[model samples]
Target: PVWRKHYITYRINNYTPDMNREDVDYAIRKAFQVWSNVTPLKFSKINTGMADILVVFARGAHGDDHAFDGKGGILAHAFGPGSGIGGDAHFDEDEFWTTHSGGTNLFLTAVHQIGHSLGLGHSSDPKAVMFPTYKYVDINTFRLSADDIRGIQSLYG
Candidate 1:
């Protein structure tokens, strides 16, 4: 189901040392903006307490059934809106998460994960950010495709 409320709060429990915390913060903020800019739903970051979306960087067997595969596969995942762990998101810390090339792009991954967290499923369109396969886009020019905007609008509107 879609978020029951317009404003969603997220908390980052842990961060990958692959990048500085400030950079990770920028990437996560920008990733959420990609959705908020296109819909009435807005996202806010929290420093403590239970949040609607709990973002974490974890490894295999951390506490979930779909234990993350290291380095080259299954970079991250999230749950649709519900209560407790339902809207949480997890990132694989095995791969070096970054803002740009030469490693997994944190912004793009978060964009895709937040889509799942917001009730979006993988898109058949390979160009869509929600596509199951991850492909790097020019971070300077990254924008959600028509499929992404349409999908999100169908939920939030």
Candidate 2:
């Protein structure tokens, strides 16, 4: 697949009182920046609630191909490239979302979700951002493994 600079927009369906709106937006932007740094594709965030992609914070919003089982089973899910609802991402609001290095950091998980949003599959590499499970981590030290870089580059390069 060839990568085109697709414009994706998203809105926060539910806000976590623990995190500020700006911080949440920053996390999302930084997550996409991870991929942009590795590929030729460009992603721009549109005004809230208007864009190709919609980011929702829900607990049990099922019916999609990938349904979240509240907490633990799957922290988040994203649609692959396609029409309507495609490229959207949903985070399980059941978990503790925080901007700090503590708690189940949403920034780390958002980065991973963005990987799936960009058409990337889960990586076997534990160090990869696309790794299947969640791990609380600091965003400053976050690094995308070579596998992740290769995967996104393959789609966008």
Candidate 3:
């Protein structure tokens, strides 16, 4: 199924002392940029509460259907396109999220999360960004596998 072209706006909710706001913002922006580079959809950053896709940095946020449990299971999740909360992304703030090679790479997971927000499902290809499991790789060396590109293009192209 093809999804309509949509604009996404992201806002960071809670701050982590481990990393600065700019670092988190850069990682998330880079993740969205990966998809935007491959597809027609556009994503933009907006001030708090006005974003269509709210990117919240929290261990667990109530009211939403999904609640992050802190350790493993599901690192993060995004709602597919629809009304109210659709396309929103929530990251497990409990995880040691980082943009560099040291910690659990936020860029990698954020890319995967953005894929879900863009209506792409988990891919079987281990190398694909949408792959169900997380794989830690250096940000400089990471590239979206063919399956990932094809999946996003199929939805947005």
Candidate 4:
């Protein structure tokens, strides 16, 4: 299902010690902004209480049925649009999240997870960020492939 409304709210629940607080904040915000730029959607961050999307940092077997495999397997995951746990993003704290260097790129991963949160699925095109895997790109020049833009727009347009 798609988000009924254009304005969505989100809350950042925890911080990853891998990077400074501001860096994580920037990555998450930018990730959402990238999606918003191409769709009729808007996102507002809430400091307290429930939001449409809840972003948190957790370790292996932290909670969800899909347990993260420490620093190896899944980097992060999100539920499709719905109520309750739906739309929430769970980041694997086991991975070394960074702004741009090596280990799983936080901003990059968030963008892909946010796609899932918004009811978009993986793209067969490896060039698409929503592809089943993660690849490092020049974050400074990162742009969602045509496939990604069309995918999100299809659901939210």
Candidate 5:
């Protein structure tokens, strides 16, 4: 379900050693920015509290039913809006998360997972940001498609 309120908050509970702290911060912030621009929802970062959405990176059986399968398989996942575990996002630490196309781009993965955190599911449109598989595109050129915009707007616009 969609979040009941327009104002939402998220916290990066932990960081991956793979990238600089700043890179991770920007990638995550940028991910939320995409959705914020398309919807009535607003997002803010919190340092020390239970945020509406919690982001983390874990490996193997990381306390959730969906365990990370090492380097590939499932890169990351997120829960839809709700209380407790809901609206949280988890990344597979086994994967080499990068800021660019050299490795699994954190921005891209976060964007997709944030979609899930915001109550969006995968789309059939390959060009859609909500598409299931990872398709690397130039970060500078990436933009949400009509399908993606409509899907998100329907929920929060």
Candidate 6:
């Protein structure tokens, strides 16, 4: 389900040491902006207390039924909009997270997870950010595809 409200809050419960603290913060912020750019939704980051979306980095069994398989298969996942675990996002700590190429780019995976948290489903459009597969593209040239825009607009427009 979609978030009933346009205002959403997120918190990084824990972070991965793979990336520096500042880069992690930057990636998370920029990832949220991907959807905010197309929708009326406004995302705010909170340091404490429960947030609409909880961002976490974990490995193996991270207290959920979905367990990480040591790396290279699943990059990350998020829950759909709702209470509790809903809208929460988890990244596999088994994989190396980076701001640039050479590892799993935190920003790209984050953008995908935030889409799920916002109630967006996978897209068949290969160029779309909502596409199930993760591919690395230059961040400087990254743009959400028409399919991605149309999908979010249909929900929040």
**Model 2 lDDT-worst window of ten:** 1-10
lDDT of 4 by residue, 1-157 (tens): 8889999999999999999999999999999999999998999999988999999899988777888888778889899998889999999999999987778899999999999999998899988889998889888788999999999988888
In candidate 4, list every pair of residues with a backbone clash. none
TM-score of each: 0.97, 0.86, 0.90, 0.97, 0.98, 0.98
Query: Model 6: clashing residue pairs?
Result: none
How far is 52's C-alpha from truth in model 2 (Å)? 1.6
Clashes of each: 0, 1, 0, 0, 0, 0
Candidate 1 vs candidate 5, lDDT winner: 5
lDDT of 2 by residue, 1-157 (tens): 2225555555555566667888888888887788778886677776654566677887775557565675566777787765567777888777767787666777888888878777888899888888887776556678888998888877877
> Candidate 2 overall Cα lDDT vs. reference?
0.74
User: Where does model 5 exceed 4 Å of error?
Assistant: none
lDDT for each candidate structure = 0.91, 0.74, 0.78, 0.92, 0.94, 0.94
Per-residue lDDT, model 3, residue 121, is: 86
Q: So what's the TM-score on candidate 5? A: 0.98
Residues 71-98, candidate 3: write the lDDT tens digits.
6667778887765678778877778877
Q: Write the per-residue lDDT of candidate 1 for residues 84-105, one digit (tens) a residue.
A: 9989999998988988887899
How many times do residue backbones clash in model 1? 0
Report the Cα lDDT for residue 45, model 2: 73
Total backbone clashes of model 3?
A: 0
Q: Which residue ranges in model 3 land beyond 4 Å of their true spot?
A: 1-3
lDDT of 4: 0.92
Candidate 6 Cα misplacement greater than 4 A, ranges = none
